[PDB]
Structure formats: C-alpha cells, structure tokens
C-alpha cells in the first residue's frame, strides 16, 4: 500500500506482482528497480518453495519479499520511503534460474512537493517551417505535479497528426507538448482545440488556436 | 559490487547474424556467472531470454541463443527481424548479488530511413505576462531512432535553458522528440533570431524564427 503512486517520504509501500503467468511454476520470483539513470537495479529474489531469500546489500534494510502457494501472491514491502526510492517495481517470475515472465510495472512517486495545476498556452505557427505544407498547431502544459494529464484534440474528433510528446522533468514541475496537424481548410479558417486535463487536482482548460 | 559492460548499440539488417557481449571488468566471465539476457521493447514490456549462460527461457523464439566467446557472455540472433529492434540487457551473478549492464540498443533497419521533420514556435503573449518565455521545438518523423539537438540565438549558440525529451515510438514504427527553451520575457524582446537545429546521421535539419 498503496499504488496510485504518490507517497509520503518516511512512509512505507507494499506491492504485489500479479498476471497470467499461469499455475504450475514460479520456482524464483524477483524484483527489479528501473529508474531514469541508474538503470536497472536487482533489489532480491524469493523462493516460494521453501522461503529461502536473497537481498542485495543494498536493499537488506529496506525490502521485504513474501509469498504464499494460497493464492499465487508475491509481496514486496518497502519502508523509510525516500525520495530515492522513486522508481518503476518490477517483477520477474519464471523457473529455476529464469527470469522469464515480468508483470505490468508499479509506478512509484515520494515527493514533498506541493500539488500544483497545470497551465496551458496555444503554440501559433509563423515562420518557422511545417512540412508538407498543412498546418501544424500544439499547446505546452507547464509546471505540474504529479502525473499524468489527458490531452485531446476537436473534442476527439481530431485524430492523426497528434503528437504527444512525453513530460520533461523542469524543477520539481512537469511539463510536456503537444502538436497536431490540419489542412489550411480548417485553420486559421474554423476551429481547433485542445483539451488538457489534469486527474490529481482536477482541471479542464480549452484554448482556441487565434492566429499570430 | 562489480560493474558490467555492454555494447552501447548495435546495427543490423533482417536476416542477417548479430552477436551482443557483456564484458566483467572484475577478471572474466565463466559458466559460474550464470550469464542472464533480458529483453526491453520500445513500449516497455521487459521479456526474459537466457538463463544460465545458454538457456531459453520457454517461449523465446530459436533464433536467439546464448554462449560464451572467449572471457565474454553473448548473445547471438540469428536470422534477426524488425520486431528485434529493442534495447538488451544484460546480468551477471556474483556469489549471491545479480549486476545488471547498461544495456545495448539494437537497430533493425526495417524501414527506409527518413530525416525529421522541425517545427518551431516562439512563445506566447499570455506566458510573457509571467515575465517567462518558453520556445518549442517539435521533432517527428525519423529513423533510426537517435537525434541530438542545438540552439541558437541570434545565429551565436545557447547551451543554457535547454531540456529535450528522449525518443519514443511513433504510430508509424518512427520516432518523434521534442525541445524547450526557456528564457526572460525580457531576454524575449532584448533579441532577435532564435534557431533549433536537429541532427540525424550526419545531416542537420534547421528551422528558425525572428521576432518580427
């Protein structure tokens, strides 16, 4: 507890690894921390058949790994949460010496900041090319925290051409872009718009494309 | 905790014969490492390969093999297709402590490769009220998927101020990017020319705007 991946720093996380790896085996089960840097990162592995566990040194005072033959689960249990510990949990399930299945990836977040709104700005074209002609317009979401936000475009009439790209990490804020492409028989003739909502906070903005 | 070396990337064509290594800079790399290769997609999905140096995980297709050459631990993908274009990775035991590599990312060209298409906008009037001004620079369409980008302001260079996103998969099976740069609302009308130069495999793609 818990995954919608937001935590307190000094609290103390708990996840499980969950899929269709199928009855039969899992002899090994590990865990593996990836994050933007350090790369991958082998925290322990378990062994349901008997208990035996293997921690890195690294991770021994901090991970806790159990499971039971009930109900095929397989726990691990995070604590003195910093914000080092931000990263995505794997897990790795498979036979002996066989990290063969890996699950869906529990993203995780320990952060003191503040939870702040987004702010949106249209993007105008002018001088400075789009190719093929046509005419490419965008907005650029800025300074909000946590993930993630939804941005859609003509009220979801409008797809191909769209282009959102990922977040860039701005101090301690989160900000991404977002292109798209119409015909000049829709701008700057008619309408094009540009939705960005923001789930933690909640925040509906829509923005109409006025030329420069 | 030694450290474990691989290849940074690698380039193939479809049916050709492709060998990844993994290096241990603490002596070399015996049947006692027990040498582990798992796969990254582009999407993200984590796939076991190898284990115990030489090892198919159950599922993994016949083209993919391990061995060892030499005083390194290898992969071998014979007969390699467009699907395999993913990043590798790479584990060695050492008595009870897994290390991981840093990875290879392997090209597969599977497509003709394409330049990238620039978009640039200059910065809004409602964030200029911020005393901010944030440029943008959209990069789609390219292949392969590597692309390292440049400012200019007033045809002299910025190497301040700048943040560009990693390369992330396109609809299409090419890659899209983006950059920003941020300065002064009064840096904003205290200049004239701004430039976001791209450059993919040689050859620099340019797009400009001036204040006017």
């Known amino acids: 507890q818990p995954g919608p991946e937001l935590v307190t720093p000094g609290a103390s996380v708990k996840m499980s690894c969950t899929a269709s790896?199928?009855?039969?085996?899992?002899?090994?089960i590990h865990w593996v921390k990836q994050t933007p840097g350090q790369g991958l990162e082998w925290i322990g592995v378990?062994?349901?058949?008997?208990?035996?566990?293997s921690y890195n040194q690294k991770f021994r005072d901090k991970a806790t790994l159990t499971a039971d033959k009930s109900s095929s689960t397989a726990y691990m249990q995070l604590s003195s949460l910093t914000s080092e510990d931000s990263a995505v949990y794997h897990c790795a399930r498979g036979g002996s010496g066989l990290l063969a299945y890996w699950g869906q990836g529990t993203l995780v977040t320990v952060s003191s900041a503040k939870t702040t709104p987004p702010s949106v700005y249209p993007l105008a074209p002018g001088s400075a090319a789009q190719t093929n002609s046509m005419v490419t317009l965008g907005c650029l979401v800025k300074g909000y925290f946590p993930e993630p936000v939804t941005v859609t475009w003509n009220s979801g009439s409008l797809s191909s051409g769209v282009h959102t790209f990922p977040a860039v990490l701005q101090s301690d804020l989160y900000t991404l872009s977002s292109s798209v492409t119409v015909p000049s028989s829709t701008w700057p003739s008619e309408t094009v718009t540009c939705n960005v909502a923001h789930p933690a906070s909640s925040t509906k903005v829509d923005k109409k494309i006025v030329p420069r | 905790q030694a450290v474990v070396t691989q290849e940074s990337a690698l380039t193939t064509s479809p049916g050709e014969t492709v060998t990844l290594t993994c290096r241990s800079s603490?002596?070399?790399?015996?049947?006692?490492?027990?040498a582990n290769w798992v796969q990254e997609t582009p999407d993200h999905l984590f796939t076991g390969l190898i284990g115990?140096?030489?090892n198919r995980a159950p599922g993994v297709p016949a083209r993919f093999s391990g061995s060892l050459i030499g005083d390194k631990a290898a992969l071998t993908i014979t007969g390699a297709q467009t699907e395999d274009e993913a990043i590798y990775f790479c584990?060695?035991?050492?008595?009870?402590?897994?290390?991981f590599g840093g990875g290879t990312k392997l090209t597969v060209l599977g497509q003709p490769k394409s330049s990238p298409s620039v978009t640039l906008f200059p910065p809004s009037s409602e964030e200029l009220e911020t005393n901010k001004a944030t440029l943008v620079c959209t990069i789609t369409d390219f292949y392969p998927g590597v692309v390292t980008v440049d400012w200019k302001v007033d045809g002299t260079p910025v190497t301040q101020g700048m943040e560009t996103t990693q390369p992330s998969k396109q609809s299409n099976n090419k890659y899209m990017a983006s950059s920003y740069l941020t300065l002064t609302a009064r840096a904003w009308e205290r200049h004239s020319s701004y430039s976001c130069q791209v450059t993919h495999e040689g050859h620099t793609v340019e797009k400009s705007l001036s204040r006017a």
């Open positions: 603490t002596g070399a790399v015996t049947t006692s490492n027990y």
């Open positions: 115990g140096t030489n």
């Open positions: 378990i062994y349901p058949g008997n208990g035996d566990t």
């Open positions: 790896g199928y009855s039969f085996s899992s002899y090994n």
């Open positions: 584990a060695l035991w050492y008595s009870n402590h897994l290390v």
